[PDB]
Structure formats: C-alpha cells, structure tokens
Design a protein around this ligand. Sequence first.
Ligand SMILES: [Mg+2]
Length: 454
Amino acid sequence: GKIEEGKLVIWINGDKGYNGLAEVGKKFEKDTGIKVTVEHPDKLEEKFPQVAATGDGPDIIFWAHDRFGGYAQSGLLAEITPDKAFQDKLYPFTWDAVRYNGKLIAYPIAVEALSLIYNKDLLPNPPKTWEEIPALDKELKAKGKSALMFNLQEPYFTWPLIAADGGYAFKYENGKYDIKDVGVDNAGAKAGLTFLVDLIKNKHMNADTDYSIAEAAFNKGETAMTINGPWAWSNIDTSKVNYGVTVLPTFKGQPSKPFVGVLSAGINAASPNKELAKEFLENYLLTDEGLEAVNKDKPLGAVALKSYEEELAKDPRIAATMENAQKGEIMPNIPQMSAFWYAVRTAVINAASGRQTVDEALKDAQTNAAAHMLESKLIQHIATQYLDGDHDGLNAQTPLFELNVVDSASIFDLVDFLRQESHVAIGMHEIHPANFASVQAMVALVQRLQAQVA
Ligand SMILES: [Mg+2]
C-alpha cells in the first residue's frame, strides 16, 4: 500500500521530546528489528488529514486530543483496542478524551490544566476557597499588594469558577456531545459569574486584567496569586519569585473545573502496521521507561500512566496539574466549541463591565452560541451549494448579493433553509436585501423572529 509495512513512522510536533521518542524507537528496534522514524514536519496537524485522506501519512501521530475529533469524524484514526487491564493503567478520565462516537481513537499520553500559582513569600498558606479571597484581599491591600490577578479577557481562564457549581459547555452522556444542550445559563454558571462580578465590583480585581498584565504583576511580586498553566512556569522562574502551584480554590464548596487538554497518540486508519503501533505504544512508550526518556527530552507535565505519574507527581506543581485536571472537564473535541468560546467570551466581558446583568449576559450566551453555529452551518451550505464547495474567504460578513449566490429562484431556497434550521416562519416581507445582505444579516433575522415570537 501507500504506507510501508514492517515499520513505524511517527509524527510529533517540534516542541515535544522527539529525541526522547526516537530513543524509545531505538529500544523497540533493538527487540523487534523494526525501525522507528520520528518526524516533526511543519503544520503536521494540517498535513495529516490531507495525506491520510489519500491512504498515506505516518503510522502514528501525536497531538492534543481536541484535534482528534475532526480526524475521527473523517474516519482517519483506527479504533484502538487496549485490553481492560491496560486501560486500568491510565487515569480513567484520560480515556474520555480519546473517545469518539463510542470508539477509542487514540492513547492518552499527557494532560494539561490550569492551577493556582501563589507567592510563598507573600502568602505561605494559600486559600482553599473562593469565598475567602475578598478578605485576604483587604488584609493584603492594606500593605500595598493585591491577592489575586489573572486573565479575565479569555473565557479559558474564567470558566473554572463559572463551571464549578454546574456550568458546562456541551453535555455528553452517550460519549456524544449534544450541541443543542449548552450549559451556560443555569443556576451554577450564574452563581459563579456573579462571584467573579462581585470581585470586580468590590475592588478585588480589575475588569481589564489580561494575560500579560497578570503574568507581569505576579512576576513583579505585586500580587499573591494568579491562574495559569505549565507554559507560564519558566517565566516565573526567570523571575526570582518564590512561587508554588496548587489546587484551584473551591466555590460553594465545589472544585473549580478547568478545561483539560490531553496529548494523545492516534494510529492512521490507513496504516497496515496497526499491531506494531499498539505494541510500541502500550509496551514501549506508555511505560515508566518510555515516558521518562521523552520527559527528559522535554517535560510532558502530568502524564496519564498512573505508575509514572506517581513518580513525577513528587513535584507538587505537577501534582497540582493532575489534581485540577481530575476535578475539571475534558475539552470537547467538536467544532461547535468555537461557538461556545465566542458566546462565553462576550458574556463575561459584558457581565464584568456591568453592561449586562449576569442573568441577561448568560441568556445571551445561549443565544449567541446558537447564532454562531447557524452561521457556520449557513456558510458551509452556501459554499457547497452555490460555490462548488469553495470555502474561500466566504465569512459571515461577506456580501451575498455581490457573490453569485442569490438567483431569481435561489432566494427561495435560502429562505427555506433558514426555516428548516430555526423552526421560525419567514414571511414574504422579510425577503429583502437588508436581511439577506450577508450570513450575519440572515442569522440576525432568524433570532429577531424567534425573539418576536417569544
Ligand atoms: Mg494486557
């Protein structure tokens, strides 16, 4: 076939320990005689679907799990077959991240999540609850320093508190994310966003803190704690700060829920070398020896193999990562997450500013999530149906009456698509060029009509 039999080719990104991985390949070669090539090509996460669709590419590819949903949707990744006793060797929740439509489609390797990062000097015993930070802020403000500063512009950093009492992005019970059940306006999320908003109202945080500003104030020793991930550690190090990394505070007695990214190894569905790859992944890479080789090349962080995690979890920073990850929520591997992110970004910006109540901000977030998803559905519809499949520059703001889309009769087809997908009636008097000026305009129409009916 297009892939060479009796060999392993592996793609992993350049920032990873590939020299370590190669050394594992050389151990595998020593025992089986099978050679193992480890490559780090540019944009390999875009090449891979393109070469795998044709029946080519690496035997094994490494990437964070969320990308593997689209590869699975396209059928590009073999269903892996670990036995129950091998699965038992990894933290159970890492297996949730490599499931797709009820099949296992990759092996979990390593795991990444936010933690609380604190100044041992200014705060030698960090707080365990959100509820005690307003106090610790006063008694700390009274000496020219603040308690907590972290990036409030990006929902990645604020969602752990918001989800703590019950918010969620997309519900999945069947190993299947339900993209119409979006858990952004429920009792939990309101409790937690209210608390984030009451911190800003009460002078404990500032609504315009972003990533660079929080990272600067903490490395300058001007604040006791920030929220960040293992990527920020080396900057703290260079800093001379006396820093620790621990459990995220609880809210309403419940753990904060950061999103978890899970670095995974999947097997090319087009590879003839499936059992060679499983043998290499279970019996050579996913062992204390395999993982240490890679980890001593470039650190992996908190790893999914229980035995080797207990070793590296001696580093209490790394113990923090895994702990917050276990208490968190797996990043959904579907495309509609970009709709969640957009909806949550706006909702939190507007609530923090006082522009919107927490209530109206989160009900909008439900509305904007649905709007953003129709937009994607409508762009793809137009691309497939009137543009011979060319997603070229066609975005929500593109003038349709310019493009060769709205025919004499095709307008009726667009209207009825809007009807089929939103279950709202569209009268003749709404079929005019301001409503059909762009995809954005078409979606605004649908949501104005739904708002009118309710
Ligand atoms: Mg076994």
